[PDB]
Structure formats: structure tokens, C-alpha cells
């Protein structure tokens, strides 16, 4: 929960929460993993965190 600030449950309008409420919801997690061989481990994965 500490590496993904856009993923937090926001209860009341805290001074944190009025900034986290402006977090865009697709700027989280992996983006486009570029694996070659199907079944083997991937090459490099672009992620936002």
C-alpha cells in the first residue's frame, strides 16, 4: 500500500486524501511487459510505482 499511493482506500477528506483523490487510475502497476519466449520468464517489464 506504501508503494502504490493511487491504490489507497480514502475514508474521510483528509489533507492527504484531497491530493490522493486526484490520482489517475491507470498510472499503477505494470504497463507493457515484453516477454519473448512463451512460457519462459520475461525480459523486462515497464512498470509505474
Amino acid at each position: 500500500a506504501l508503494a502504490y499511493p493511487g491504490r489507497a482506500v480514502l475514508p474521510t477528506q483528509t489533507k492527504n486524501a484531497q491530493f490522493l483523490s486526484t490520482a489517475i487510475a491507470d498510472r499503477i502497476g505494470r504497463l507493457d511487459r515484453a516477454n519473448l519466449i512463451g512460457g519462459e520468464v520475461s525480459a523486462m517489464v515497464e512498470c509505474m510505482e
Binding site: 482506500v9 480514502l10 475514508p11 474521510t12 477528506q13 486524501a17 483523490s21 487510475a25
Partner: protein, 48 residues
């Protein structure tokens, strides 16, 4: 509905009554529609 799955959104109005009640098939009109007058969709986080 045979498989214990109901469709459609769920209202939660407080309706104190003594009469007939059937929440599955309401004969009366819906309390309001999703985009009606003086209705408001709550944000994204549910933040009070």
C-alpha cells in the same frame, strides 16, 4: 433468479409500512432513476 442471482441495481429507501411487500418484484415505481432530477453520483472513493 432460479440460480439465486438477481439482476438490476438495488434501492435502499426507508419505507415504513404495514401493507404488502415484495422486494423482488416491486409493483410501485422506482424511487429515482440513475440520471434523474436532483440525484447525485457519489465520487470514486466514497469520501465523506
Amino acid at each position: 433468479n432460479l440460480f439465486n442471482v438477481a439482476r438490476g441495481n438495488l434501492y435502499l429507501v426507508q419505507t415504513a409500512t404495514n401493507g404488502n411487500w415484495s422486494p423482488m418484484a416491486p409493483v410501485a415505481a422506482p424511487p429515482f432513476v440513475r440520471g434523474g432530477p436532483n440525484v447525485r453520483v457519489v465520487g470514486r472513493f466514497g469520501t465523506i
